[PDB]
């Protein structure tokens, strides 16, 4: 297996990076030999949409292509001030931060492997080799996929990733499998395409393998109006919005069912590196130790090559950058890339060169992992504050909650039936709108559990992130919400 | 009508720009009052696809609009605390108004700097804190105001409810209007010779393309009418096409630019057959001075620009695909669409469940250059410069052709706009096209084969004069002339 200490050698022993405009690359330029001793992935021809199968590809002097001259790109230099690994706080970066300059002629001047003229011009649909090498190495270091022909493709984000895998696998009048309570934007992306959602139940630890098996085993084309679904959308770590994180045992169990029913697993994992210690009343010995500490992903267990892993920089570095990637078997990744060519094309070149300078040249794999440890330490303090505030202010007779292990979401259950629903407007939805609107008026924003339902009126929940608000404000916000609850649940 | 000198006062008398994280806006917050006196666009309910009709407002993005009310604390949308973005300052060195050459910007360039806490320090209306966080599908209000103003000045559209929406690019724009206005089985209308990328974006959606004959000035109205009128008796198993894809200026790959008279003839035909006109205009500012063998001011420069389809859009049936690619940087992955509120809202919906918005890092760098430094003046100055650069490059390739290409078998008109030179050769004369491609590559010149661009007749070759040096432009043409002479004896 590839370790941080093996990367300098892998690069020495592998082909040079092409530093000209929009060069052909793949992950295969960057993968370690070990990868090719593993078996090949299963084929998925039968699962490709008619749209997706239809998609196709587009020393001498060239007057051939429509690439403009960098002369008429009016950016000579792009600089960013970034934290130097010791200190990662805004105060520390101001104090001791490093300035990274990307110049035109950087490649001629031997300064950089990513020229601003190249970053400012058109790119390929897989993204720059400069950034794809880091993403590929990162994928190998963290997940180490157990099949030979895995590949990364850079993205305009997981939102675009999900839209374009939905188009790749699904047709008008198909079902896909989601968790009881899922990401609203994921469902929001699926419906307009004619894709229906068959929900599968979950516990405090997330997706239940029994329910998944039960839905797929008990599937009748006639009643549902469509064929057995073969796509599973799931958030394994810090589930949106429950915050439930599957342990290794649940994931192995889920993978078995997917093997039996021949499912493609789409793991959307934005908070994968936000795994914290379990909450208590009130450190990683090495980078190998930190990586070992992370509960393994579906990609890690992906013996069959049936997994698409949606990764993003949004919850790790910046949602603004609109930069992510997909990890999957060559055949599906190749299909995704064609959709990018006639769509988003690639994430912004300025986004790519700023990320590459920080991740590749400055931080490296060490500095990046150092930053994710700090992000783990940060979100831990915030996780404690929201749970401490919840039980010190919230009415325990009306509100119930499990403290979360990973993510930035807190799931609060509300006994909606312990409020005067005997007379007048006895609609669970009515108490919901009331409880939400009563919260803004006492000055707190929360997410309505009903937005996250994949589709039944039982208990009601509220989603409360501990990422959005200043650490000091976390306590004040829950109190404000506690007050709202008491008022609304009163005379 | 809105002019550059009208802008400072439109701003003074308008609402404050929202400097918060992921704020709600629309062009309707930056459009001058004159717009609202004009009539409204026609309704497009009957042209909206099942997919697009079916789309809905993002409940999270919609809930973010709550972040506006002050002293309100958020446990809602998962937009991270700025402390978890490791970019303190982002700086960019760009040219001053007098000199735009890379060498001139090296010597006299300005360094614009975007820092976290700039909006609290009163340095700019765009905080890096905001740029680096999630944004709404329309793009940042700071960048959207500039593009909306720019759209008013240049095109100043003749209907009330026109709107702009920021973009991942014109390629992403075309992807989303095709899904918004087309279903499996339908036809769309494209020029006989057209952008290969535009045709490839449509084929896998099950959309067929109805070709329409061109001349030296582009799309022919009598051919468009003929195709659509003939649809009544000769349907191709599908309903009459209502979408026209058109590149009016420096058309790819012909280089044919429709003049105002030609755009007026086409538009009248688009009224008769109630067509929606999608005008892909990436080379609109690559318009050059006429070929032989100085735009006094901004006010003169805008006079000399051929009016776009949007400028004649009285019905509101025009969707304009704009991009910064051929004027600032293709790498920026930042464009926009202009159209009636109805289709732009549907466009915006799909963006929310798609690309979402152009990179915030792309947006703050474009806004800082365009709004804070150059201004509309500086940008027009830069566009005039661009005009003059491409003029010189157009000259170079045409001069070469007139000096090397054999008139016996080679025919060519000079381009008025864009970066493409379109060469016509008579195949019958030589002792069939594959033999002309490879032969020329044998002399070490590469050109693009016309057959690659079909949506019979004479054979053509597209030669771009955008990138290569004045030296290599001649050389390359000379290498072609000799290869053609060898193939045709
Ligand atoms: C926040 C979030 C996203 C956002 O992805 P981008 O890369 O920012 O487009 C996607 N999926 C889930 C589950 C999220 O929570
Ligand atoms: C170059 C070009 C574009 C540019 O598209 P973006 O995705 O905005 O870069 C669009 N249309 C045509 C016809 C082009 O030639």
Contact call for residues B34 and B407 (beta carbons, < 8 A)? no
Gap from B11 CA to chain A (nearest CA, Å) = 26
For residue B456, being part of any structural domain is answered with yes
What does DSSP say about strands B276-280 and B318-323: parallel, antiparallel, or unpaired? Answer: parallel
Q: In chain A, how many domains are there?
A: 2
Q: Do B203 and A54 touch (CB under 8 A)?
A: yes
Ligand in closest contact with the CA of A324: 1
Picking from B83, B172, B338, the residue whose alpha carbon sits closest to that of residue A317 is B83
Cα A39 from Cα A304, distance rounded (Å): 9
Same structural domain, B263 and B327 = yes
For residue B146, being part of any structural domain is answered with yes
**B92–chain A Cβ distance below 8 A for any pair:** yes
Same structural domain, B336 and B462 = no
For residue B8, being part of any structural domain is answered with no
Which method was used? X-ray
| Vertex B104 angle, CA B103 and B105, to 5° | 90
Q: 């009508």: which residue's tokens?
A: B1
Same structural domain, A296 and A398 = no
Q: Do A349 and B329 touch (CB under 8 A)?
A: yes
Cα A154 from Cα A27, distance rounded (Å): 11
**Largest Cα span, chain A:** 85
Percent helix, strand and coil across chain A, each to the nearest 5: 40, 15, 45
> By residue range, what is the domain housing residue B450?
392-487
Same structural domain, B319 and B430 = no
Question: Is residue A324 within 6 Å of ligand 1 at its C-beta?
Answer: yes
Q: Which of A347, A370, A404 is the last residue of a domain?
A: A347
Question: Would you put residue B316 in left (φ > 0), alpha (ψ -120 to 50) or beta?
Answer: left
**A81–chain B Cβ distance below 8 A for any pair:** yes
Cα A455 from Cα A431, distance rounded (Å): 19
Q: What are the Cα distances from residue A464, in Å, to A379, A461, A474?
A: 14, 10, 10
Same structural domain, B179 and B293 = yes
Q: Going along A118-235, which residue ranges are E strands?
A: 150-155, 175-179, 196-200, 202-203, 206-207, 231-234
Cβ neighbours of residue A170 closer than 8 Å, sequence gap 6 or more:
A49, A176, A190, A193, A195, A231
For residue B2, being part of any structural domain is answered with no
Same structural domain, B334 and B408 = no
Query: How many Cβ pairs within 8 Å bridge chains A and B?
Result: 353
Tally of residues, chain B: 489
In DSSP notation, B70-108 reads TT-EE-SS----GGGS--SEEEEEE--SS--SHHHHHHH
Q: What is the CATH number of the domain that holds B457?
A: 3.90.1150.10
Contact call for residues A241 and A343 (beta carbons, < 8 A)? no
Q: Which residue of B has its CA nearest to A372?
A: B84
Does A159 appear as a known binding residue? yes
Q: Which residue of A has its CA nearest to B397?
A: A63
- Ligand 2 is surrounded, with C-beta below 6 A, by A 66, 345; B 169-171, 195, 247, 252, 280, 282, 323, 325-326, 330, 335
Residues of B within 8 A of A80 (CB-CB) are: 87, 89-91
Which of the residues B361, B417, B437 would you substitute to probe the A interface, choosing the one with the greatest number of A C-beta atoms within 10 Å?
B361
Q: Do B60 and A90 touch (CB under 8 A)?
A: no
Contact call for residues A297 and A267 (beta carbons, < 8 A)? yes
Q: What is the CATH number of the domain that holds A203?
A: 3.40.640.10
Same structural domain, B399 and B356 = no
Which phi and psi angles does A430 have, rounded to 5°?
-65, -45
Residues of A within 8 A of B357 (CB-CB) are: 322
Which phi and psi angles does A235 have, rounded to 5°?
-110, 85
For residue A217, being part of any structural domain is answered with yes
Cα B454 from Cα B172, distance rounded (Å): 22
Q: Starting from the edge strand earliest in sequence, which strands make up the sheet with B110-115, in order?
A: A98-103, A77-82, B89-94, B110-115
C-beta contacts of A226-230 below 8 A and 24+ residues apart: A226/A173, A226/A174, A226/A175, A226/A196, A227/A174, A227/A175, A228/A175, A228/A261, A229/A174, A229/A175, A229/A176, A229/A177, A229/A198, A229/A263, A230/A47, A230/A169, A230/A261, A230/A262, A230/A263, A230/A264
What end-to-end distance do the CA atoms of chain B give, in Å?
A: 60
Same structural domain, B315 and B174 = yes
* Least CB–CB distance from B200: residue in A56, A184, A467: A56
For residue B244, being part of any structural domain is answered with yes
Cα A153 from Cα A326, distance rounded (Å): 5
Same structural domain, B341 and B450 = no
Same structural domain, B300 and B426 = no
In A, residues 132-161, which contact B (CB 8 Å cutoff)?
156-157, 159-160
Q: Do B362 and A351 touch (CB under 8 A)?
A: yes
Q: Going along B27-167, which residue ranges are E strands?
A: 73-74, 89-94, 110-115, 162-167
Q: Which residue of A has its CA nearest to B368?
A: A75
For residue B40, being part of any structural domain is answered with no
Gap from A384 CA to chain B (nearest CA, Å) = 15
Q: Which of A303, A320, A347 is the last residue of a domain?
A: A347
Residues of B within 8 A of A467 (CB-CB) are: 78-81, 84
* Least CB–CB distance from B331: residue in A348, A463, A470: A348
Picking from B276, B47, B179, the residue whose alpha carbon sits closest to that of residue A192 is B179
For residue A438, being part of any structural domain is answered with yes
Same structural domain, A286 and A426 = no
CB atoms within 10 A of CB B280: 26
Q: Which residue of A has its CA nearest to B54?
A: A192
* Least CB–CB distance from A123: residue in B175, B331, B356: B331
Same structural domain, A194 and A341 = yes
Gap from B446 CA to chain A (nearest CA, Å) = 5
* Least CB–CB distance from A62: residue in B168, B172, B446: B446
Cα B212 from Cα B219, distance rounded (Å): 7
Q: 């039996």: which residue's tokens?
A: A260
Separation of CA A121 and ligand 2 centre (Å): 12
Residues of A within 8 A of B388 (CB-CB) are: none
- Give the pair of three-digit tokens for residue A194: 């004619």
Gap from B419 CA to chain A (nearest CA, Å) = 8
Cα A444 from Cα A474, distance rounded (Å): 10
Contact call for residues A374 and B199 (beta carbons, < 8 A)? no
Picking from B329, B366, B84, the residue whose alpha carbon sits closest to that of residue A313 is B84
In A, residues 168-207, which contact B (CB 8 Å cutoff)?
172, 184-185, 188-189, 191-194
- Give the pair of three-digit tokens for residue A387: 């749970």
Burial B41-80, CB ≥16 within 10 A → b, else e: beebeebbbebbeebeebbbbebbeebeeeebbbbbbbbb
């Amino acid at each position: 297996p590839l370790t941080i200490d093996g990367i300098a050698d892998l690069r020495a022993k592998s082909a040079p990076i092409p530093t000209g405009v929009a060069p052909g690359t793949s992950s295969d330029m960057f993968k370690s030999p070990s990868c090719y001793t593993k078996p090949k992935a299963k084929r998925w021809d039968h699962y490709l949409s008619e749209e997706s199968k239809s998609r196709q590809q587009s020393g001498l002097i060239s007057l051939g292509g429509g690439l403009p001259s960098p002369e008429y790109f009016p950016f000579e230099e792009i600089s960013v001030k970034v934290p130097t690994p010791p200190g990662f706080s805004p105060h520390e970066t101001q104090e001791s931060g490093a300035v990274l300059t990307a110049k035109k002629g950087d490649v001629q001047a031997g300064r950089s492997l990513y020229d601003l003229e190249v970053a400012l011009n058109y790119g390929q649909s897989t993204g720059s080799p400069q950034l794809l090498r880091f993403v590929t190495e990162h994928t190998e270091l963290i997940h180490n996929p157990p099949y030979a022909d895995w590949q990364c493709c850079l993205n305009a984000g997981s939102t675009y990733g999900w839209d374009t895998v939905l188009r790749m696998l699904c047709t008008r009048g198909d079902y896909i499998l989601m968790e009881e309570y899922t990401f609203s934007s994921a469902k929001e992306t699926a419906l307009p395409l004619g894709v229906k959602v068959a929900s599968v139940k979950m516990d405090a630890e997330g997706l239940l393998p029994e329910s998944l098996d039960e839905v797929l085993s008990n599937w009748d084309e006639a009643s549902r109006g469509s064929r057995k679904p073969f796509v599973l959308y799931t958030i394994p770590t810090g589930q949106n919005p429950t915050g439930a994180t599957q342990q290794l045992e649940r994931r192995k169990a889920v993978y078995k069912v997917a093997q039996k029913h021949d499912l493609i697993i789409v793991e959307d994992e934005p908070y994968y590196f936000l795994q914290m210690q379990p909450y208590t009343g009130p450190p990683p010995a090495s980078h190998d130790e930190f990586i070992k500490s992370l509960i393994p992903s579906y990609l890690s267990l992906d013996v069959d090559g049936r997994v698409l892993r949606l990764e993003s920089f949004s919850k790790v570095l910046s949602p603004g950058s609109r930069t992510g990637w997909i990890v999957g078997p060559e055949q599906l990744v190749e299909r995704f890339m064609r959709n990018c060519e006639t769509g988003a094309q690639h994430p912004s070149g300025i986004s790519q060169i700023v990320l590459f300078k920080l991740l590749d040249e400055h931080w490296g794999h060490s500095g990046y992992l150092d930053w994710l440890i700090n992000l783990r330490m940060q979100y831990t303090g915030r996780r404690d504050a929201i749970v401490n505030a919840c039980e010190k202010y919230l009415p325990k007779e009306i509100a119930k909650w499990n403290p979360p292990a990973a993510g930035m979401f807190h799931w609060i259950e509300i006994d909606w039936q312990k409020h005067p629903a005997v007379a007048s407007g006895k609609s669970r939805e009515a108490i919901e709108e009331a409880v939400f609107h009563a919260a803004v008026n006492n000055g707190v924003l929360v997410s309505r559990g009903s937005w996250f339902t994949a589709a039944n009126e039982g208990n009601l929940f509220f989603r409360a992130t501990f990422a959005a608000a200043s650490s000091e404000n976390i306590a004040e916000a829950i109190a404000r919400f506690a007050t709202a609850l008491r008022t609304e649940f009163s005379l």
